[PDB]
Amino acid sequence: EFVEEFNRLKTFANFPSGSPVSASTLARAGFLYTGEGDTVRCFSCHAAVDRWQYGDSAVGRHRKVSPNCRFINGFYLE
Amino acid sequence: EEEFVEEFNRLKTFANFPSGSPVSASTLARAGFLYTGEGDTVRCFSCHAAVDRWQYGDSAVGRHRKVSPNCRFINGFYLE
Ligand SMILES: [Zn+2]
Ligand SMILES: [Zn+2]
Question: Do the Cβ atoms of B32 and B10 come closer than 8 Å?
Fold first, then answer.
């Protein structure tokens, strides 16, 4: 289901307004917002990531904690 | 110091500026910035404000105006 970006961006309701990394960028990087703080979790690899700061690459950090993540490696593409 | 009112002289200071920067040396120099020589920290030749941690999509003049809306450079003081 969450394979679709939108189903993912939806979960970003009440996302910390001042986050240096937009909900959109994360939804795009394949993350889901857990609801607490700025913690999000990859729907494909389940790897969770938080404490985002200026300069971060949503896709970049993603790959760092899960370089072999299915989504990162374009498994769900067209 | 030097005649930094000229873009070319400001650009000379970016000799060892880090290669992989999202914002280019010329874009920064064109915005009145001198390279301090450390990391990606640059400093306005006119208002002396320092700015760093450049990111993809940043506007050199934009951030510059952010920390010094009154910078003489940003305001045309040096115009011909
Ligand atoms: Zn993943
Ligand atoms: Zn200035």
Answer: yes
Query: Which three-class secondary structure string do you get for B17-34?
Result: CCCCCCCCHHHHHHCCEE
> Domain tally for chain A?
1
* Mutation target vs A (from B51, B55, B66; most A CBs, 10 A cutoff): B55
Return the exposure string of B53-65: e unless at least 16 CB atoms fall within 10 Å of the residue's CB, then b.
ebeeeeebbebbb
Task: Give the domain range for residue A74.
Answer: 1-78
Tell whether A55 lies on the interface with B, counting CB pairs under 8 A.
yes
Which helix (DSSP H) or strand (DSSP E) does residue A49 occupy?
A: strand A48-49
Resolution in A: 2.5
